[PDB]
Amino acid sequence: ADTTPATGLVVQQWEDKFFQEYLHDGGFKALMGTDENAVIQVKEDLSKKAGD
Amino acid sequence: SITIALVNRLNNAAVTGASTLEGNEEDMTSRSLRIYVDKRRNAVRIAEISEQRSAISLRNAARATLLDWAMEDTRDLIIEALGSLNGTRFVDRTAAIADAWLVDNLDRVYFGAGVGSGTDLSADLAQLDTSADLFNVAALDGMILKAKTCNPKIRPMRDPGNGKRYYVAFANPHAFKNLRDSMDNEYLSNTVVQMQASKLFEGGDLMWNGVIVKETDNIPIYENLGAGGTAEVTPVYLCGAQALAVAYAKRWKTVTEEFDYGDKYGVAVDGIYGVRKIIFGSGSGDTDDLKDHGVVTGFFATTGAATVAAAAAAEN
Amino acid sequence: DPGNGKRYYVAFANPHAFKNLRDSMDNEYLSNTVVQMQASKLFEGGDLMWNGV
Amino acid sequence: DPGNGKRYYVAFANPHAFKNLRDSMDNEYLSNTVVQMQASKLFEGGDLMWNGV
Amino acid sequence: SITIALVNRLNNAAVTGASTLEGNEEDMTSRSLRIYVDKRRNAVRIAEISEQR
């Protein structure tokens, strides 16, 4: 006859890498700016001063 | 076998103010897919007297035919994996498996002209008639919309710029001809783009809404799966990034062996590998409600000759 | 506002609403205009442009 | 077989069959295409090309 | 005459890992075509009086 490995001795391998879901970022980052006519206004004044 | 993993996104509301974050952490979810491999071989044996008698070189012919057979086997395995229902071959599908797959993948399945219910696959295929349920631009646009609205989004194969998302569709020559008949006198003959206009005469892979449609001659045509039990049905596969997975325990390799004191000479091609369609669960369990990760399948009626027998393509 | 009566705005729409807008646009304008950039969007796709928006 | 799914063949047809094919091809496709050679074939009457054939 | 040859493709099912390939090989089929050659000729003969006339 022919020698075969036991059913419980069949090795399964696992990968250390993983996939990530695809997420749409909206594209708003292109509209952010500190200029007066920016579609989205960025006010970073509270990063140096105090207040909520 | 080899197991690959997918990590689901976090969808928990932010902890605002001074509220404690310790003990209120988000439960990360992961999914796994197991891909098996198998050994596939073929061989050709030639006698020395037959080598002497033959006018052509039989060894070179054997090597070339073995290489072609290996390529054909890989292509057939990939095509078969593309049409697998939860890892089960389409011709070997059952009613329960097909119904579960249709229910759990209703956001990635688009029948012709956007018809079909959400409970039974057999009835949905039986709603396909050759008159209005062919493969056209409208069906392709609906399939593209499906690829962009599924709960786990399908990754485009490329993100070249401003809102452009690219995918690759595989279709039979008959479905490709139907798409060309839909595209020829409406958009291809009137567009000012030279590259797309030239495709009307020098036919090739088409482009529509960012999807590159390719003509693969070996996509099966299932027999008597359409309206009235007499209409042929063909699947079209719209794939993005991470659509199929190929595991290679041993690549295609050729060996030679001698038999009968060197009288006979045999060439063999062998390889250990396995091709599967990447599917991940969506329910509470790891593989509770499996979903096609990166593939949208569309069944359309056709008038072409069926490559699969009626008994073979039936729901066994 | 580059002048010459041209005013530009941004628009954000869902893929379903965007598909409806593209269906309204392609069969009439995108397939007939001689503008290469907008004509190529019939096949390549992407964000649409209409009336400066 | 250059690439990109392009497969070429040569068809030989009688002038009657060629005339029938041209009658099927002229008022539908050749009159509107922007390809200079195929458009010129409408008035010059050269060998036809369709689907790589 | 001359002879040209064609080698048909292999269309057998793949052998499983545990199945035996030694002895279950696939026989390659080869086809031949025999092209004959023949002598084709044609002649025209004219008399001297006809040349004068």
How many other C-beta atoms are found inside a 10 Å radius of the C-beta of residue B201? 21
Nearest to B212 by CA among C43, C39, C30: C43
Q: Rounded CA gap, B63 and B42, in Å?
A: 11
Distances (CA, A) of D7 to B69, B156, D4: 22, 28, 9
Could you tell me the two tokens for B262? 């060197």
Identify residue B262 by its one-letter amino acid code. Answer: G
Q: Is B209 left (phi over 0), alpha (psi -120 to 50) or beta?
A: left
Distances (CA, A) of B296 to B123, B238, B270: 19, 5, 32
Nearest to B244 by CA among B29, B56, B81: B81
DSSP-derived 3-state class of residue B247 = strand
Alpha-carbon C6 to chain mean position? 15
Nearest to B83 by CA among B246, B235, B214: B235
Q: Rounded CA gap, B226 and B133, in Å?
A: 10
Looking up tokens 């072609």 gives B68
Looking up tokens 């020829």 gives B184
Q: Rounded CA gap, B181 and B175, in Å?
A: 10
Q: Is B145 left (phi over 0), alpha (psi -120 to 50) or beta?
A: alpha
Question: Any bridge partners for residue B152, and if so which?
Answer: none
Q: Rounded CA gap, E16 and B69, in Å?
A: 15
Q: Rounded CA gap, B107 and C20, in Å?
A: 18
Backbone angles phi, psi at B234, to 5 degrees: -125, 135
Strand residues in E1-53 grouped as ranges (E): 2-7, 30-35
| E4 at B interface, C-beta within 8 A | no
Q: Rounded CA gap, B299 and B313, in Å?
A: 14
Closest Cβ–Cβ partner in E14, E15, E28 for B62: E28
Closest Cβ–Cβ partner in E17, E21, E26 for B38: E17
Could you tell me the two tokens for B142? 């609906």
Nearest to B209 by CA among B142, B154, B299: B142
HEC secondary structure over chain A: CCCCCCHHHCCCEEEEEEEECCCCCCCHHHHEECCCCCCEECCCHHHCCCCC
DSSP-derived 3-state class of residue B236 = strand
DSSP-derived 3-state class of residue B286 = coil
For residue C32, the distance in angstroms to the closest alpha carbon of chain B comes to 6
Distances (CA, A) of B195 to B174, B188, B192, C39, D49: 23, 10, 9, 12, 16
Find the distance separating the first CA and the last CA of chain E, reported in whole Å: 46
Q: CB–CB of D29 and B185 under 8 A?
A: yes
Q: Rounded CA gap, B216 and B309, in Å?
A: 20
Alpha-carbon A38 to chain mean position? 27
Nearest to B91 by CA among B254, B316, B303: B316
Residues of D21-30 as b/e, b for ≥16 C-beta within 10 angstroms?
ebeebeeebb
Q: CB–CB of B193 and C23 under 8 A?
A: no
Q: Rounded CA gap, C46 and C37, in Å?
A: 11
Q: Is D25 left (phi over 0), alpha (psi -120 to 50) or beta?
A: alpha
| B212 at C interface, C-beta within 8 A | no
Nearest to B141 by CA among B214, B244, B213: B213
Closest Cβ–Cβ partner in A15, A22, A27 for B3: A15
Q: Rounded CA gap, D36 and B301, in Å?
A: 37
Residues 6+ apart with CB under 8 A from B90: B83, B84, B220, B222, B313
How many other C-beta atoms are found inside a 10 Å radius of the C-beta of residue B302? 25
Q: Rounded CA gap, C51 and C30, in Å?
A: 14
Q: Answer whether B158's CB lies under 8 Å from B258's CB.
A: no
Number of residues that make up chain C = 53
Backbone angles phi, psi at B156, to 5 degrees: -65, 150
Q: Answer whether B137's CB lies under 8 Å from B179's CB.
A: yes
In degrees to the nearest 10, what's the CA dihedral of A22, A25, A27, A33? -150
Q: Rounded CA gap, B19 and B13, in Å?
A: 13
User: Helices B173-183 & B137-149, crossing angle to 10 degrees?
Assistant: 100
In degrees to the nearest 10, what's the CA dihedral of B147, B152, B158, B160? 90
Q: Rounded CA gap, B127 and E20, in Å?
A: 46
Looking up tokens 């998302």 gives B165
Residues of B291-300 as b/e, b for ≥16 C-beta within 10 angstroms?
bbbbbbbbbb
For residue A21, the distance in angstroms to the closest alpha carbon of chain C comes to 18
DSSP-derived 3-state class of residue B308 = strand
Q: Answer whether B285's CB lies under 8 Å from B270's CB.
A: no
Q: Rounded CA gap, B313 and B309, in Å?
A: 6
Question: Any bridge partners for residue A20, and if so which?
Answer: B7
Nearest to B111 by CA among B100, B122, B124, B99: B124
Looking up tokens 């509220």 gives B19
Kindly calculate the radius of gyration of chain C based on its CA atoms and give it in whole angstroms.
12
Q: CB–CB of B69 and E25 under 8 A?
A: no
Q: CB–CB of B242 and A19 under 8 A?
A: yes
DSSP-derived 3-state class of residue B45 = strand
Give the chain B residue nearest D29 (alpha carbons). B189
| B68 at E interface, C-beta within 8 A | yes
Give the chain E residue nearest B66 (alpha carbons). E10
